[PDB]
Symmetry: C3
Subunit: 558 residues, 3 copies
């Protein structure tokens, strides 16, 4: 039994804070490492000790194993957690840790580069009884061998070469074959509306291994998990234990030790195929923890120390439903591009029932163009799936982010999409409903400018002079003698500008407390977000944060 006194977390952002929280929960000290850019980061801040690594690019910063392990030796860390990304999956680094006496909360180096090759991994998988996507490389016959090959591979089959021709019937296989240009043809099975189902595997040193239910990660933005959930909405008990056992046999196969997940893919027809196993902890791991009450990082730490998994498979719980969403600094209707800037506004959503949020940022922080733009992960748990969904949706309503372009408006729509409620999931969901997910702006109504004006005007007190502190002249009132209150504002939202003239012989209409604009459109009292950060007023309007500011005649004239 070894034992960690200080755990070094060789990573950054959300995940670094994430692991660090679990360490702390056990009385274990935490060590962070940072590039020069993250010198003033949150993960470095919440760390008991930090150590400066490289400079800016991950290439010569967080990827510098030798320095990371050096740091660990110097800062007195007895173990290393690599979190996901970076060096979490490359035996070289896993071995170098071994060649240092450092425990490595990960799978033994072997399993790593073994699963790192499409080849040998395809090998070990078949051996353990893990279904693989029927294919047919090597040989490339003509109008006769393919017929037999294709026949077993299920007929909804594809046709490639050596660098598509979707065959649907054996009767279409005829012309399907006589097509070669630019003979040499491959027979790879094509999958219909396939859901991405992975299984959370977790072993220990004592040969025990188990799967902690499965997660669906179908909704993906041009390859890249955007939403995750556990359990997988559709499949029942049998299908679960089938894929779980498969994954468990897959891990037993390469003698796995830590946490990792087997990433499958199952069509509309229930057949599930191995795609690849992640020899690290999964990003979307929170939804699993949600429905199981388990701290996978704690577990991750315990096996490292060499203890035995606290449960048997008959005990792995699975109650309720939890949905996870990834908040990025991407651009919704902007071809999704790593928008890196400054977080002028960043308000997370209050603690509340099944609410969880694993972030790595805070207001004022800069989103550098050197790392994954993931701001935070919002997770909601619910008894039913509607609950988790409706809760998660509320967490997205109560979250605002300004100073950057965010995939937040996008995510709000997804959870609030009839398609998503109905669980009509497959890995093409994103590109399918894109028209509803990535709309296009509507100039804003006079309904809006009045609201924005009121808001701004009320976020701009009036200057109280020490000379005369209670001067009625400090009113942002608009008071006029016999006529009605007049206030005129030159506002500019986005790349548009209006000259809102506020008039009201009726003091009512709008008020504003904290970060809430309380409006009264004759009869209906509604309240929305209105947050002032600097010379900017971020207003919540139709589920989209709009930045408003005053026009500066001088600035621009220049």
């Amino acid at each position: 039994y070894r034992s960690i006194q200080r755990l070094l977390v060789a990573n950054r952002g959300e995940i670094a804070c994430r692991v660090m929280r679990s360490a702390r929960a056990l009385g274990i000290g935490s060590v962070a490492v940072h590039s020069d850019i993250d010198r003033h980061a949150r993960h470095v801040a919440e760390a008991d000790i930090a150590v400066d690594l490289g400079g800016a690019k991950p290439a010569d910063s967080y990827l510098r194993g030798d320095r990371i392990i050096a740091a660990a030796l110097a800062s007195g860390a007895q173990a290393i957690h690599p979190g996901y990304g970076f060096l979490s999956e490359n035996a070289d680094f896993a071995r170098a840790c071994e060649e240092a006496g450092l425990l490595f909360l990960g799978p033994p180096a072997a399993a790593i580069d073994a699963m790192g090759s499409k080849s040998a991994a395809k090998a070990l998988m078949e051996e353990a009884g893990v279904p693989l996507v029927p294919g047919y490389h090597g040989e490339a016959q003509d109008l006769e061998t393919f017929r037999r090959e294709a026949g077993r591979i299920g007929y909804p089959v594809l046709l490639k070469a050596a660098a598509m021709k979707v065959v649907e019937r054996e009767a279409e296989l005829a012309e399907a074959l006589s097509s070669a240009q630019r003979a040499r043809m491959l027979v790879e099975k094509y999958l219909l509306k396939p859901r991405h189902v992975e299984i959370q595997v977790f072993a220990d040193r004592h040969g025990h291994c188990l799967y902690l239910n499965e997660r669906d990660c179908s909704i993906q933005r041009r390859h890249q998990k955007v939403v995750e959930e556990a359990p997988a909405p559709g499949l029942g008990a049998e299908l679960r234990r089938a894929m779980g056992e498969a994954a468990v046999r897959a891990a037993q196969a390469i003698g796995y030790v830590g946490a990792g997940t087997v990433e499958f893919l199952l069509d509309e027809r229930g057949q599930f195929f191995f795609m690849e196993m992640n020899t690290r902890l999964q990003v979307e791991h929170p939804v699993t923890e949600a429905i199981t009450g388990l701290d996978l990082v704690a577990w991750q730490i315990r096996v490292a120390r060499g203890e035995a998994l606290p449960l048997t498979q008959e005990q792995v719980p699975l109650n309720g439903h939890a949905i996870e969403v990834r908040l990025y600094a991407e651009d919704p209707e902007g071809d999704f591009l790593p928008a890196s800037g400054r977080l002028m506004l960043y308000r997370e959503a209050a603690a509340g029932p099944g609410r969880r949020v694993d972030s790595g940022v805070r207001e004022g922080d800069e989103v550098s163009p050197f790392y994954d733009p993931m701001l935070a992960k919002l997770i909601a748990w619910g008894e039913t799936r509607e609950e988790a969904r409706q809760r998660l949706l509320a967490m997205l309503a109560e979250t605002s982010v300004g100073g950057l372009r965010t995939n937040l408006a996008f995510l709000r729509r997804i959870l609030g999409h009839p398609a998503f409620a109905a669980a009509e999931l497959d890995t093409g969901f994103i590109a399918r409903h894109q028209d509803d997910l990535l709309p296009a702006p509507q100039a804003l109504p006079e309904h809006f400018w009045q609201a924005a004006a009121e808001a701004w005007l009320q976020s701009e007190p009036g200057h109280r002079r020490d000379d005369d502190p209670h001067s009625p002249w400090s009113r942002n009132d608009g008071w006029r003698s016999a006529l009605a209150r007049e206030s005129d504002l030159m506002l500019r939202c986005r790349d548009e500008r209006r000259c809102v003239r506020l008039r009201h012989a009726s003091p009512s209409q709008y008020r504003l407390d904290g970060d809430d604009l309380v409006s009264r459109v004759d009869g209906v009292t509604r309240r929305s977000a209105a947050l002032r950060r600097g010379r900017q007023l971020f207003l919540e309007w139709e589920g989209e944060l709009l930045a408003i500011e005053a026009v500066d005649p001088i600035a621009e004239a220049e």
Copy 2:
């Protein structure tokens, strides 16, 4: 399966906030509606969206169905919860909601007006095997038919006509009959020291139905529940399941769907009789939730959405004891009258163990003369009943309310009454011990004025002038040269006034921090409430809040 996005709560005060909290807990948006008087109310405040209805009287405000349903359509509510009171029990409104596509978290309109008639309800009840209070209308014979009738109705029987003559023995029935004036005689059973026991029923759409234990609501101020508890102190397992099944058969009878309770009545002899069923959620519902860990409003919402009750009767828990008390703006020793004014002081009691408080007010709020004067409901849970009682009592000690007359001093006495500890309950408890519950004032001792003075004097700093900020002249000290500290105060409590002269060559005695007056009556250091709100000092004295203020020679001389 339908599904609520926004839930409109067609009600106000405590219950409105109550339901709204559950909605929010599920990620469901909430819509409020208000009269013009409640335009600035707490329930409107804690609402995601509010809508102005009528004006002042419930008649043309919260009772205006057409507008309430209009509001719901306009504000985007997919369902309506009517809470208790108002329109929560009248098929007309329940149907109008149906004729709008709105889900109505309540029983189907049928059961409503069916149970709304003493007649037809008496019908359906007998049919389902629900005991009714033996009576004898219709026929009115003389000295012979009554003998047989009375004989079955149990002899402790009453005698009415067509608009009392308590018969106790068959041998007294003789003269009991020859009395008619102003022949036409009715034979209705009389009940001895009857406890009010109701059962919390809750069905769904799928025909399932169950009872969630029972509640005793015996202690009533001239008809009106004042205290409630669950479970009913006396009765055991058999009696519980008997009344429960009875109530469940009663609900199955009219095809009930939501939440509701069957209100029974059982004498000293264990026989229980149906009185009426409430086709809504019960006000005193918190004590039930307390001993069951169930959110009846959540459940209420779920059946509306059409899900199935999450439990079977073998699972309905029942651990511990919970007591509920109703805080009103009534007048203890003032013939109990709807005292409507301004809440100058309103301090609830800190969160603590089994403590719960469902209110609908806050300091500064006005208690209008248009609605039920219920301020809040204080609920305490305990393992035993003494625990709940002692805790609840502590919550009443730590609660202060000034600017109005309150039934709070009254309630404190009830929980602290030997009769109530001993569970000597029957529906006459209130009018019986009235002498101990509604005492009569004692002028206050010189013991008091000294205390009040010290308090006031210490709630009145001394004016620090910007001219000279640390001036020793700001001391509320009473400093005198060689003699002892002299301070004289002209105080007036209630309709009495004293000229407290504070002298002390001993700086000690009293001090005051926050809302606590710490006194030291030579040897005994005691601490009580002393809260300053405006030109008024509310002091806790002998379990009764006393308002104290300074006498104004000018004001009155005028």
Copy 3:
């Protein structure tokens, strides 16, 4: 069934606050009593009512039964809890309470003075089948009787007289006997590396009795429990139930009622012997509560009221591990002496997972030379024992205490000692590893003074004058014209003084927020405690709080 309305706690410090918290948790009012010195104490502060007793020495203060019981009658207390120490174990006081109608949350007076005599207690114990340490008083033969006596007493035996000669073999017994001077010889069994294992017993009035697992309290500073844990690290199920039953039979024996523990002693050989039973609640009781989820004071209160223990022995839980440490105002490397002074600095460690802390002090409080110098008890719970240990260690890291000498540095070392992790426990542990537990100072490195200076300088702003509030002259910067920032400080730590000269053409290095000094020793960002209290700066350095202050040329020259 009697019932407490107000509970008087006849004690002080931590335990008084401790019991008072449980009372409050049940809605039970609490009454405190104090000496004149504790007139402004925390336990008196957290009390609903307090009563002045004696003056300074416990002799004529908390030990004055007559006054304590008088107080209880006067303050309206229906019961008395004596906590540990003082009068918690002396039938005289227990009887006097009886002769007053006061419930006494303790064992019936009988058991008290019965267990109070080494004699009669040795009697009752043998009768109930409770092993005792084999001895041999009365008779004192020569070279023949001892041989037989010694033979049964296990040969690792001692030899005393009437006021040591450790015999190890029967073959050594020869010369072992012919030694008498200054015949009259006693034969008492000697124990090898004995662990101190006591069992938490708890009965009621209804004859039921049970043991709530055991606690190990081996690590003791020259007789005096310093560390405690539950369960006892080594022993298994059989040994547990054996000692438990023994203790239970011991309590049944004298007809015990409340809480108490049987203090055993078991050698390396597994044989356990009775030492004495405490007829009160144990100080170290929190570790037991930790691993059982039980409030022993609540229980203590309930049996007093005459209820029946809520569990059977098959239910007494035992999950996880909890370690308790006693924080005293002793002197680590100062021959352990009751250091009584003023708590200039007292910061407990934040609420966190298995964290618990039962204290009786607060910053500013004076540690009088009249009572047990125990500041607080820090308890950490963990799933495994390493967890509890590592957590508890973190609680000791996050705890600072200045203005006195504290056994805190000592305790930190114990939990962080390889010997303690390995559970190498026996009652000699303290005096054995003393060399590692009570080191000796090392003057502090230039590494330190730079740190202390920076800290001090940064805890000393610069004086902002109302005259000119933003004056750049307020910088504690060290700004110099063309050269580098110069700041010179005359600091004095302990009885040493340096003239730290801070120079930095690099603004970086140190910063300071809250009570954290964030340092950057080129590459490694570390953070430690630095708390300013008055003209003193308490810095955390190498797990030892160092007091630093500025040298005053005038003060000393004088």
